[model samples]
Target: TITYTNKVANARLGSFSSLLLCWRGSIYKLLYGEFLVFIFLYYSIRGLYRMVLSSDQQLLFEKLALYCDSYIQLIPISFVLGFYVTLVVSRWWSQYENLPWPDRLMIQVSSFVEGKDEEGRLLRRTLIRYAILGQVLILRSISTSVYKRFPTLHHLVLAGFMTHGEHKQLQKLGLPHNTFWVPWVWFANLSMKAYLGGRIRDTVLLQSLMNEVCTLRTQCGQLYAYDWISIPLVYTQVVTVAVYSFFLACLIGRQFLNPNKDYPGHEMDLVVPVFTILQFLFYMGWLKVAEQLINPFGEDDDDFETNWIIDRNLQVSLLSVDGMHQNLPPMERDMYWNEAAPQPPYTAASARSRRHSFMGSTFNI
Candidate 1:
């Protein structure tokens, strides 16, 4: 989802320089509002303590600031934020990996299902359509973008992922729960029919095809499971409370006290709280990362590109089965056919870095 093309150098001149300037999906974009609020509150409290407070009020305010500073240590912000963000990141990637892909099923369907005739082509296309239909149904349930595109079965029919007859059949099913798996059942029945009609060569191949479909079904189930089961509310509350409490304390505790009073750690009356701002950026940015990844199916800039994925999966699966099926290019001998040891030429940029290929550890020991 984060798209940046320029190659960044690791030298001192380039390291983290360009990256810091990037706006899309950047920490600055995520935390700027919170940062501004923090700066405003911090300086407001500082101004009140310094300029507005009488002698007694200033002393009392200083005491309160010290108290808040000392008590803030009780909240283990780093520990909680670290663990929570790690868990969210792991869950995010697992959801991405579990996204159902029809490529394997398409390959098996294209290869194992035979015939170059109209019936054969129809069978292959229909089988893949059912497979993608199941995926779309599941995605519609979980992903916000996918749901927005296909708000109903009618939308799916309009998109050509489902026919009118199929949509009517889906509506007729009286199941109270999610009917996403119905298409998979249809796929299995169709595959068996194809096998019976001698389209599939053997039982073993049919079993392999069914196995691929089952794998896809399992992936869809995983996606649904992730949507159903989220991080615990109590855990989220604890982490959020810890972060905000730390900053709330910072609004007062981080203020530059009067240098005339010779308060400990308050000898310098620097106008800006540079270190406090940096701390806010780091901690708040960490929380923002977790927030964005916690539900990647949303419309966040860093969220999964669910709409693009839906389009790509449908296009590639259909292409693999129909457009490219049995459409092989002419075979010919290659330049390396007669050479036992072949070395392909590298581009000029990579030629200087080329080295001898390694065969095995013991090849030339």
Candidate 2:
């Protein structure tokens, strides 16, 4: 996710080849420490057998190596890794989808919650602010980035999210549980007050505003739920044990025993263990994928940008509900107003790329 490769992938040939050299968020970056440890341990075992062991001891070591080599295939690491990574990856994407933004709620507030005077403007702005405040509270609990931004409730006050008086009111409640929902309650009360006071004149518009706020609050709740409940530790422990066990077996099982000793599969003097290196890279990197994605709200390179989301929602929400309230641009007719069908001109470079939409297969018939 940190790496951007859209242009490379858009190419036809030699496209994927460019991906091998990326440094940040690459599989190589994640697995390098484990890869080095594996290599050193495998070499230590091989060296101990080759140089330090006496002939009689060498016989016992050979027997151990042969046993390990046969049983290494029993672990089924590929099957375990594939399923675990698939689950983690799917959960990670869903976490992103639940990230709440205030655009929909702000638009409704601007259009339906009517007021043109300073008091009305304050009502509209504070309503959306409460929605934004609720999201900030939930995200601060769950996201490391948001926590860093608003390390203390007092910081939220300084950042203009709350006044000192409101923050004091929040602490005065001394509620044992999380109070992120408190802002939603205030928002509902204020919106209903506006409706009763004739700011939101219609009952149906009030319903729309209420519906949008509820949707936004629900998204915040779902994000908190994901952080509260994560993937089972038992499943993670199982996958980690299986992967490490497979490699522990491979350290001795994959060595190239002396052809002179006449052991099974000792026909060649191949010393490099090429396939073992590749296998180490593949499975070790596979495990690293799960590690990176297990907490998408973390501070990793590919993790969600919760800090940016906070800024964007605050700025856009205030703008939509306050600064741009009742603002409009004059509407004009299109160039081909009388025509039933219209075709816009395409630039010279893009002309060749334009094509008709696909009709049904039997359209010609």
Candidate 3:
């Protein structure tokens, strides 16, 4: 969803220079508010220690700051953050992979569910419709955007994903659990009926169709399981507490004491804490990455584009099953039909680097 990969592909000196200025989905966009808050709090505490405290109070504060600096290292921030973020990124990628795609199912139905008549076309369209219906139902539960699009059974019917009769039948079941799996049951029954009616040619093809249907069902179940079983709340709380407490300790531990006092790390009385600000940027930015990826079905810029996916799946499934079913384009001779060693032409920019193809590592030997 974030479309900046092409800009940095060359990896030259100035390749990443332009990316730093772009605001969309960048770390600066996500962290600027937190960065400003940290800056304000850091400066406010620094001013209170330096300007408001009496001489005796200042000495007391300096001692407390030194103690905080010594003890803050006890918190294992890097270790905890590394493990937590790794878990979040893994879950994120898994969720994306398990998204139910109807392409394979559509291909099977279009190829094997044979007929040129209206009834045959209807069968193919209905079969793919059921597949996409199940997909949308699962997506509605996990993705906020999909739920917004289809809020109720009536929305699904009105949107042509479900017929009115099918909607009524679904409502009549009154099942306590999620009814997303209902469509797969209907699909299985329909496929069986088609097989019995001589629409499917053989047992092997029927088994293949069933296998693809089971695969799609398994994908849907995996997504549902992910939504149902989330990371433990206690683990998240522990990481959050550690990161915040460490930065809170930094407010005091990183103060600029008087250079004349000759405290151990207070020799340099720099007004601005350069390295401390950079540290906050890194650590806090790490936390933000987890937060964004924890549930990728949300509307975040880098989150899965669920709404787009929903539309694309439906459009492509229908096109494959109904519009393009048995519609083959005319075949003609290819450019390399007569050539023994075929070589494809390259563009002007790419031609400069083109070379003879290698057959194998030991070809010349």
Candidate 4:
């Protein structure tokens, strides 16, 4: 057993030093992962919204054009700044590896809190990141699930009233009226391309966020499967009911369509408004949950204790080989103090015999 003592200090120092190195390395990984995740989620939600609201090619094209223009203007500066800040933070965080675990955690907490305070920025920055995530999920679900469930009615009632002409006007700007998949694919590509181009600064934060989003995407697959099971049965009934209702209206000798021809009732005519409202409410609720999940420390479960993590690395470094030991060879001391030298060489002829005798005594040990 290696007891803790000055003699064993080197081993302890080595252990701590290595531990800190590992911790900082992990942090570096996490920061980059998260940076990528946020950028991906932002564009994903933005794309989902475009598909849900857009009626024709023109509106789609125009919105795309506008977004591209805005993205070009806003993203370059934001990406550069984010990249630079991440670099500085990662470098600073690596310094904390020599600190003790508790100290590291405290430092991170204090720094984060102080930053928030100094900026007086509402926790909104964090909250907004979450909002994008939640809205992405909800919008995606509604578009793929509800919209696909009842197609004919969706088109006739809802699509009929939608401003296709307005969409055409917007299309002049850059929006396209392609099949349903167009918007989804375009947004995804745009997001990924941007992220790929951006430089990662902090590996720790990035990893943490990316892992969570990846998990969510997996969960989304399962959710979609489950939701689909119930949807088809429910949708069949809805379509049947809608058809029957239309027949009854015709039988009563009244107009089967909405009295207001401009806004007839289709499958989505009934569904869109309701779903839109629900989407908003769902987003708000999920946004809170998403915020909690993304910023785990805010709630308690998975939050990264930045200070603690940093300090642990620092502590390890402080206790490592470089911290408390002398590594000089004994021969180096002869230059300043012959008497102090652990193994002094004899040069004088008279000292030769004494040197050999001294050497023999030392070797016997």
Candidate 5:
């Protein structure tokens, strides 16, 4: 037998929204604020090279890939360093009391609800968040280190420092209205300063959110593999066909069909095709990896324990109900409906019962 109290039910519903916001906000803060800064700095520097060094557009893209290749080589060391830093800092500085009330509450609930059973093992969202944070920290550290190693790269990444006027326009666009908007706007300003400068829109949170979501998905375990042969069937077959068709139409057609017989450099045109392909592949692979992690029984960063969450919710719900109401009832054999009753409808237009509705027996069941 079961019963629900209005106060208890409303509280539970309210907590659901509170839990969602805090969890998402904490994850977002860690990724965009700390890790994304490093990425923006790296790309900004790369854009400088494209603008100043490469006379032809094709050379710029080829050189950019070369630069990225060089940058990628440092990821392993950076990853180790970041892991160490986070491990140490988390142990030493993590203070539950110091966190905002909402964040603390979220952590408390998450800790309470997670890992209580076999089903509880599938709470992959937390693992996904940590992994994404790790990737961001590692990539940022390596990119920043590379930029620092070569002072020439500094201008490419830090070109924004040379151009400050663009930030003023961003400020005008009302992007600084909220904390969530701050990091994105900052990143956009930094990127534009390095590349587009005053010519482009100053900040775009929508684009940044999309990019972060993609990054988060990549970190979930699908895209990171040592060997490329294990590429999933979806990508190898269906996606490949669709992508190749588009590639052929765009790349092959653009190159050969031009009446002037003049075309963009193979290198410059390569950026879009290559990036688009890799981005699609990375996300596809990540989805597979994420699926494994979500199960928690298999290895992947995204796996989470759902049974535990359900159990905890049940416990809380039961406790809340018990606290509010003692006696309960069992199911009855008969069913009844007052469908044909001539009574006032429960609609907004009927304001006559607004004040006395809850006080009356009309709602009692």
Candidate 6:
């Protein structure tokens, strides 16, 4: 997701301005085109009122605009849109939490599955492969990005995540239901094999490793479910109809009439309905947020980057299990090894941010 938390760590003025300048994730970017459409239509209605209509037709159009402006508040678009987006955000973040990460499994594999030889290396690499394999399968179903990356099961074989022997079985399954769990079964069978073959030292470590793989698969299944079942269509359509109708009515209803006629609130012909434009901005912006977040697995700027995460998982997990296994940096004594309280240096620029850290506020001043 696009973020500026690091730059805005101070949470002070001007940081929000910086965020506003970012075109990718801002409401301004998404809402600009729609705003233009609304603008042209508003003026289309506006110019027609001023130039195209006679006195009597202008009066009738004026009456219609007033009718629309008056009753627009009855719908409570803001209130309903608020609740709708809240549900969307909940599901979006829920998927973020449930997306599997292989950190714990990799660490477990590295520590427990011990054989320093080529077979040992092969076992560790294959273990990590199966874990990522299950995750990739689940992700492909849920995310278009991953599906494109590994379009066919053969692509996974070409990428070394699977062998030809395994891919044939995977294709042959032909089961309608999800086969993401297949690799976890393979993982368990292989782990048990490791236990019997004297590679895994203890039954407890074996059990722990097995448990972690299943946990990964469980999370994968949850992501699949979220993709399979989404927020109801009727609710979204209701909101859509509500907003579109409100704005459609507004194009006429929010017009400024002839200033000389003493038309109640229409006494001034400012032409631009300043507050009405802002109302559209706020309401439509919130609706756009809900729309983008409804499916966070897609290619939106704020949607989670599954491709990047996949690469990171492969690189990090494989390094921990194989390339970096038993690879420890040279250890020696630190500069403050003998000191009881070593005060780490803070640069002059960071001195303002340094405090003795927090304690209970009940302390006497």
How high is the CA lDDT of each candidate model? 0.85, 0.83, 0.87, 0.34, 0.34, 0.84
State which candidate has the highest lDDT: 3
Q: Model 5, stretches more than 4 Å misplaced?
A: 1-344, 349-365
Weakest lDDT window of 10 consecutive positions for candidate 3: 66-75
Mind giving the per-residue lDDT tens digits that candidate 5 earns over 1-365?
01224435665557555543543213333334423453454345445644555446545544444343333232443343344334334422222112111122223224323233333323223322222223322222222332343254234224322124433443466553322223333443433332342322333532442355434344322322211124355533553344334333322222211123233433242333355345434433322332232222222223222223323533443343233233357767533354554554587778776564356676576
> Between the candidate structures 1 and 5, which one is better when assessed by lDDT?
1
- Which sections of candidate 1 miss by over 4 Å? 9-13, 359-365
Once model 1 is optimally superposed onto the true structure by TM-score, how far is the C-alpha of residue 300 displaced, in angstroms? 0.9
lDDT of 5 at 62: 46
Tens digits of per-residue lDDT, candidate 3, 1-365, equal 69877787887989877877878888898998788888898889877887899987888887888898876773499999999999999999999899888877888888999998888988888888888889888989888988888888799878888898898799898769889899999998999899898899899998999999899989999999999999999999999999998999898878887888787677887778898988888888889999999989998889888887778998988888888877999999998888998867789878778776779999889
In the range 1-365, model 2's lDDT, one tens digit per residue, is 47575657576776788778878888877877777887788788777888999998988887887888767774587889998999999999999898887777777788887778888988988887888788888988887877887889989988888877778778888679988888888988888888889788899898888888778778988888898998999998999999888888888767777777787676786768898888888777878888988998888888887787788888888888888887789889989989988988899888787988999999999
| lDDT, residue 324, model 1 | 83
Question: What value does the lDDT take at residue 60 in candidate 3?
Answer: 85
Q: TM-score for each prediction?
A: 0.92, 0.95, 0.93, 0.18, 0.19, 0.92
Collision count of model 4: 54
**Candidate 6 — worst ten consecutive residues by lDDT sum?**
67-76
